[PDB]
Design a protein around this ligand. Structure first.
Ligand code: XQ3
Ligand code: Y01
Ligand code: Y01
Lengths: 475, 123, 145
């Protein structure tokens, strides 16, 4: 009845002399009336009005009939609440209303979420409530669900709400900037140490090597530090994976690529160690690749910077999606032409094929010499085919990929401000979540204002957060 | 002398036909190119250090000569002869290919995207 | 009172049998009533109208009460005037109005900044004033700022 916009039916059914349908009743899924109302909620102009009206009416009735228990407290089997479910489903229309819910009624004004602090002239300061909007690990928070979760219809719009922006700003100012630069400095120092260790690697001798000289004191420390740092990265990345209740593939592979890369960096660095103990000969081959990957995956720290925040996100986006889609066609061309040219030539075979492929790649770059035609028969058709290869690839494809690449960068330019805000929020939340619980509680934000008293008179004493704005038409 | 010749665009600022050019080249140079060059330098440092470490001579002069050769390659000229002396040549070529692909194909002309967007704002 | 859009309060306070608040009064910063009015001025449609109305009313009252001294002449500690401060702060709404201020009143039309030169058919020639808008090094100019 509630989902079908029939207030009279709901009113009659709630209070009937024969039977009553308690509003705090859960189905098999665990969803109660508010859960279902949010589920059918839509962002359309007409639907939102009636959804909000029915939600407020039902919540007020439930509070009036049962003053001890709050209806929104009930959770479904998934553990989410109507606010959290609305945030996860991307239904801004009901979410924004729930965030700024204010009740004028004196009897049941306690359940309001937005209070008025004071007005001085055009300046108005209002005190929002964030008891469940921000949690220091005690329970799931709306902010983490809104940010980390993927495939949300209106994530960017829901992030731009009155309390969210101010809370992110305050959290960033309080400790985010202090620890972000410490992070950058420590990581860069570790990378420099790793590079110096890699350079001063004794090729002569069978690994492991004896350490007797003065330089050995310094050289061994670099390897030990790098190995311990890799192990620490692996432990951090397993702890984080379990912290988010084991996010699936969609969380790791599609987005947040850096969360996966450090895992790879975590593997190779330790893998080499094993070889360094037994597989002495070929530990450099993988150690150098680990070093290259570590150097290349430092854009996670650049994500935060406003000036260069977009660059990392858009290079990661374009690389896997545009370049690979183009590379499919490019590889079709490469395979066809290379096979044709290899077949055509007459030597009078694996080594010859490899050498020809090397020569053709060197040509593909734009350097080298065209000497292969001398030995082969039918040189004219060979040159014609080479010309078609060069024309097609270089002239058309090489710089026609640039068309959609520039279009992608154009989309990113059109949405640069919005994406930077998301990335900055992600990095600051990331940094926060690694802190210990007790320290996080010590860094709690907000006040303990006793705005109102309960029905029995006891003080609510709930955590809140105050903001202010300016209006000139309120005369 | 070079700086004096290069800093004559102040007088070209006035001309209506070429007034924008100087302002927008000064704007793009310090803001877009440097922001891109941060990432490019990350790539350069990582790959150059890796390649220098990998090679087996059997050191400052050798490192400088290798860096010169690698820069000459980076332009698009020179020859790929270093692989002969080093061990594990196949991984060396793979790493060089990744270097060339990433930088030249993606970054070299993806900077052009936001550069053209900047020139679009100026237009 | 002026910044809060209360013309009646300003009128009463300016002329009261008990005490009077002179409009050419400077605070610690040096900003006078016009300076403060410009400071809170905004480019919004509603704010600009009342800001300009109050500015004109207060300037006319000050000129009427004291004909010898012009209120806009007073400078703050920074040395700027309401026109210069508006130019520096980027508040176009009050700036454009100040530039083309024209007073129809005969008694106090001297303080106007835009005059009419002559009209020939559709052509209209008007004579603006730039006494402080352009300065040859004598004092800071709006254009340079
Ligand atoms: C200790 C706090 C004051 C700050 C904390 N930094 C660290 O703990 C360390 C930094 C460094 C640098 C050099 C050597 C050793 C360490 S230990 C910090 O702020 N963060 C770490 C947790 N974070 C992560 O684990 C992301 C998000 O889950 N995953 S990741 O991409 O794989 C990653 C990113 C950077 C670092 Cl570094 C380690 C990792 Cl797995 C986020 C960000
Ligand atoms: C355009 C791109 C994105 C697609 C091509 C992928 C590259 C990574 C391929 C193109 C040509 C390949 C090369 C062709 C021939 C050789 C020689 C081969 O070893 C030899 O020198 C052969 C001599 C012998 O074994 O006797 C090792 C790999 C290499 C460099 C291949 C490694 C990978 C390369 C550079
Ligand atoms: C892509 C760009 C924007 C970043 C790279 C900066 C360039 C200015 C660097 C790249 C390689 C560098 C060169 C690498 C090696 C050398 C040799 C060095 O002197 C030598 O010839 C070594 C011989 C010896 O000392 O015995 C002088 C600098 C030079 C040309 C370096 C000067 C600066 C270069 C050109």
């Amino acid at each position: 009845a509630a989902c079908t916009n029939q207030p009279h039916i709901v009113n009659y059914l709630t209070e009937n002399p024969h039977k009553k349908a308690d509003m705090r009743r859960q189905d098999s899924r665990g969803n109660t009336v508010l859960h279902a109302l949010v589920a059918i909620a839509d962002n359309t102009r007409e639907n939102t009005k009636f959804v909000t009206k029915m939600y407020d009416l039902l919540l007020l009735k439930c509070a009036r009939l049962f003053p001890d228990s709050n209806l929104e407290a009930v959770l479904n089997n998934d553990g989410l609440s109507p606010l959290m479910m609305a945030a996860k489903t991307g239904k801004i229309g009901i979410f924004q209303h729930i965030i700024r819910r204010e009740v004028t009624d004196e009897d049941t004004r306690h359940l309001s979420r937005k209070f008025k602090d004071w007005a001085y002239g055009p300046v108005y300061s209002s005190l929002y409530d964030l008891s469940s909007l921000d949690t220091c690990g005690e329970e799931a928070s709306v902010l983490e669900i809104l940010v980390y979760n993927s495939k949300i219809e209106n994530r960017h719009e829901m992030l731009a709400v009155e309390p969210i922006n101010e809370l992110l700003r305050d959290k960033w100012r309080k400790f985010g900037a202090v620890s972000f630069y410490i992070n950058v400095v420590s990581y860069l120092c570790a990378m420099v140490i790793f590079t110096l260790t890699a350079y001063y690697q004794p090729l002569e001798g069978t690994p492991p090597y004896p350490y007797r000289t003065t330089v050995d004191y310094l050289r061994l420390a670099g390897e030990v530090i790098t190995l311990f740092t890799g192990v620490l990265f692996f432990f951090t990345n397993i702890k984080d994976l379990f912290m988010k209740k084991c996010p699936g593939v969609n969380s790791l592979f599609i987005d947040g690529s850096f969360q996966l890369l450090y895992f790879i960096y975590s593997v190779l660095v330790i893998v080499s160690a094993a070889l360094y103990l037994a597989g002495i000969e070929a530990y450099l081959a993988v150690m150098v690749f680990a070093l290259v990957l570590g150097w290349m995956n430092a854009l996670y720290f650049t994500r935060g910077l406003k000036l260069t925040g977009t660059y990392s996100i858009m290079i990661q986006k374009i690389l896997f999606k545009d370049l690979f889609r183009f590379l499919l066609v490019y590889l079709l061309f490469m395979i066809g032409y290379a096979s044709a040219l290899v077949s055509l030539l007459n030597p009078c075979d694996s080594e010859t094929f490899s050498t020809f492929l090397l020569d053709l790649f060197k040509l593909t770059i734009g350097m080298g010499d065209l000497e292969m035609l001398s030995s082969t028969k039918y040189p004219v058709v060979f040159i014609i085919l080479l010309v078609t290869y060069i024309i097609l690839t270089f002239v058309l494809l090489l710089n026609m990929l640039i068309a959609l690449m520039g279009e992608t960068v154009g989309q990113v330019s059109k949405e640069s401000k919005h994406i930077w805000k998301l990335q900055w929020a992600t990095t600051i939340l990331d940094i926060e979540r690694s802190f210990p619980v007790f320290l996080r509680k010590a860094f709690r934000s907000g006040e303990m204002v006793t705005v109102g008293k309960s029905s029995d008179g006891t003080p609510d004493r709930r955590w809140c957060f105050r903001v202010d704005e300016v209006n000139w038409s309120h005369w």
